[PDB]
Design a protein around this nucleic acid. Sequence first.
DNA 1: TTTTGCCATGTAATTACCTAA
DNA 2: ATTAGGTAATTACATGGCAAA
Lengths: 56, 55
Amino acid sequence: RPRTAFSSEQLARLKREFNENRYLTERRRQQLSSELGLNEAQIKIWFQNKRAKIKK
Amino acid sequence: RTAFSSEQLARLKREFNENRYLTERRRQQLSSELGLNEAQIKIWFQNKRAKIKKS
DNA sequence: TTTTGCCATGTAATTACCTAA
DNA sequence: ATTAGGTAATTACATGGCAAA
């Protein structure tokens, strides 16, 4: 899949969600997908990477 | 779906007894020796590990 | 017994998500 | 973003077995 760039609103909402729970459940991912206008896979990958930076 | 031969399952079981986790190399050796693809071996080990957890 | 018919089961393979690189 | 290997949960099959006329 192509490399994308998140808008400031997308990044803000993504950051507030990760603040509550670093893990996404399926329904939750689907919801953030239609609400933000982002492919579920991009949201899934964003959470993986954010968790990886936190550990380091 | 492939069904392993008597001597294959035998070698697989013995290998699994000495080490339940494969290294890329061991996996290659078993492949060329048993005439199986590396994927059939990887999945055999994954499943063996899973079957063991239930008992 | 013989024969016919259904189904429990062991198991290879697939799928989704994870970490770590 | 991609990649490999792991776990856990399913699925799809080849079988052997048991039931019963």
